[PDB]
Write a protein that binds this ligand. Structure first.
Ligand SMILES: *[C@@H]1O[C@H](CO[C@@H]2O[C@@H](C)[C@@H](O)[C@@H](O)[C@@H]2O)[C@@H](O[C@@H]2O[C@H](CO)[C@@H](O[C@@H]3O[C@H](CO)[C@@H](O)[C@H](O[C@H]4O[C@H](CO)[C@@H](O)[C@H](O)[C@@H]4O)[C@@H]3O)[C@H](O)[C@H]2NC(C)=O)[C@H](O)[C@H]1NC(C)=O
Ligand SMILES: *[C@@H]1O[C@H](CO[C@@H]2O[C@@H](C)[C@@H](O)[C@@H](O)[C@@H]2O)[C@@H](O[C@@H]2O[C@H](CO)[C@@H](O[C@@H]3O[C@H](CO)[C@@H](O)[C@H](O[C@H]4O[C@H](CO)[C@@H](O)[C@H](O)[C@@H]4O)[C@@H]3O)[C@H](O)[C@H]2NC(C)=O)[C@H](O)[C@H]1NC(C)=O
Lengths: 307, 307
């Protein structure tokens, strides 16, 4: 069991901004009009593998000129409507019980080919956070908390960005999967982090810690899509302020991989990549009894499985 | 398929020294008398798990004062006689056909809980190298080539060091597993690398490349045992002259983990750690078609399985 000692928290108080979807609409740049999310038809390649999972080891140079090697995975999903599931921790109903569980354990319940940790959660109580829809079922309605969202609609539409409560409750072309992160990294192929800071953080003293959350290097995970509508999962190992990538670096890395929209999921010691049910990354938390590293018990999971 | 582009080769000519076991005996330090290998009764904990597999991420400082993070795995095996197998590539008979195969593919044929790449092989032809005994069966008799050896005898004796041909053909308490590496890292708890250079390399121009093989940082793997007779498997990710550890650093790392005898197995792009049949490390070779990394098709495999 992990010690939970690499905590990378975007908020010091309540999770998410306090302002409404309408506030987000009214503050976004004029280029985006009145619509606060993007849509893309998912790819639907029946004559292709379910996914391709690739390992990268790359040299990143930060602003100060310092070089660092980072390691991680990029996963490309060819038929997201059929193969992608947002899973509650442990099993259906896990969120109602404030249950936390390793990615690998949750992943095995659905024989996920690739699984990563998913959304944010209360690291003291285990409470789930954000909006959650799992295989067509509404698991958690945040009441319109304005954090970055990723969803899939019944007709295969991929959705990225900010959603109202009315949006997620829509019964026309309803969401079949939905999860929330913190920070919209890329919008229409451009870095959207400064816009995210304004949308997803209260304009208070909170912004200092939130900008640190953005600027510090750590382990990170993200989900996005490319121009063909393939879903892209991203993971990079790290440790807060010691190894890994900050969100500017993640967004640039994904942009160069031709990702068009992408959101940041949970990171730090939460970041986990699981291949066919086996841990296949280097987590940053220490195990309770040693100098060894241990995967963290987390909340929702993003699972890629056979159609 | 991997491009085989991180090659870490100890020899520029034929594999191994040209001199006999008697030569090795006659040149070793007086402290070791006339016996050129060590023995340890294997642990036999029936009331324990098969293995414990631990992840490390550690800061290494080299001679020049330069700091680097390295990542890898330490696996502890509680009943080695029952749980450890040396596997030919692909399946029994693979060496006879100069067959190469991914660790993960070979590992799945025996449902290995943990598997690593094993011995050296000819990177042009695929020919197996060293001595090989797999589950009691003599696969390859090198004819007494004096490289570092790891074996398990029928009565559970762990054997590390230099062996004659007569030693490996012994029908009293015969070897049930046997594999060869290059360099005996630790002997009786002390670093034995300089002694290994003398034993395992011809005293010719070859020593320059061999000392580079020892001194350069790269991905590395090793096998050893602790004072209780538990088998210890070691893996560290890396890339020759860019990331990872040199053999001095590996020996010191293992010595601090209370490893008493240990040999160096194949490294560079060969180094692979596989958990329950899934790749669970970051290989250094590039894939044939990309900037992505790919596991290498290698030769023998060290497999830990259920008794
Ligand atoms: C992403 O956004 C950050 C934050 O922007 C800042 O906060 C927002 C909440 C909002 O209020 C913005 O209006 C505001 O800029 C950007 O980081 C900021 O970048 C600006 C511009 O580079 C910096 O402004 C400078 O602040 C100095 C005091 O700390 C001040 O002395 C500077 O003025 C002097 O020097 C400059 C030349 O360097 C010159 O232009 C002036 O005329 C004067 O000589 C200047 O005002 C902020 O300090 C930065 N704030 C933080 C917290 O870093 C960031 O650049 C942006 N990134 C991208 C990629 O868009
Ligand atoms: C592991 O082994 C290496 C190799 O040892 C060398 O090669 C072997 C095959 C064998 O022949 C040995 O006899 C031989 O030493 C060790 O690395 C060597 O270390 C020695 C001693 O430190 C070095 O000797 C020095 O060589 C210089 C020329 O390059 C020479 O100028 C030096 O003499 C001057 O300076 C020293 C003080 O630094 C002083 O003692 C002298 O009196 C004189 O002022 C000195 O002779 C070798 O160059 C090293 N060789 C290589 C290839 O690095 C290594 O130390 C050892 N490691 C461990 C942990 O045991």
């Amino acid at each position: 069991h992990s010690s939970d000692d690499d905590l990378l928290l975007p908020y010091t108080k309540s999770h998410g901004p306090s302002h409404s979807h309408r506030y987000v609409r009214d503050c976004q740049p004029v280029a985006h009009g009145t619509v606060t999310h993007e849509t893309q038809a998912a790819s639907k390649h029946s004559n292709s593998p379910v996914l391709e999972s690739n390992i990268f080891i790359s040299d990143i140079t930060d602003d100060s000129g310092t070089h660092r090697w980072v390691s991680g995975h990029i996963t490309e999903v060819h038929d997201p409507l059929r193969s992608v599931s947002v899973l509650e921790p442990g099993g259906p109903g896990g969120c109602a019980h404030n249950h936390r569980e390793l990615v690998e354990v949750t992943a095995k319940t659905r024989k996920c080919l690739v699984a990563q940790n998913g959304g944010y959660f209360d690291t003291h109580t285990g409470q789930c956070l954000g909006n959650i829809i799992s295989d067509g079922k509404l698991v958690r309605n945040s009441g319109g908390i304005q954090n970055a969202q990723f969803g899939i609609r019944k007709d295969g539409t991929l959705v990225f960005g900010y959603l109202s409560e009315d949006d997620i409750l829509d019964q026309e072309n309803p969401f079949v999967q939905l999860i929330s992160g913190v920070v919209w990294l890329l919008r229409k192929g451009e870095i959207y982090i400064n816009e995210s800071i304004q949308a997803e953080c209260d304009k208070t003293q909170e912004t200092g810690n939130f900008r640190h959350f953005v600027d510090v290097i750590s382990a990170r995970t993200a989900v996005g899509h490319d121009k063909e509508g393939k879903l892209i999962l991203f993971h990079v190992d790290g440790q807060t302020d010691v190894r890994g990538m900050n969100l500017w670096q993640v967004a640039k890395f994904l942009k160069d991989q031709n990702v068009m929209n992408a959101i940041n999921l949970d990171g730090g010691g939460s970041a986990t990549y699981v291949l066919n049910g086996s841990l296949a990354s280097y987590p940053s938390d220490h195990c309770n009894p040693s100098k060894w590293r241990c995967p963290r018990a987390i909340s929702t999971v993003l699972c890629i499985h056979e159609r």
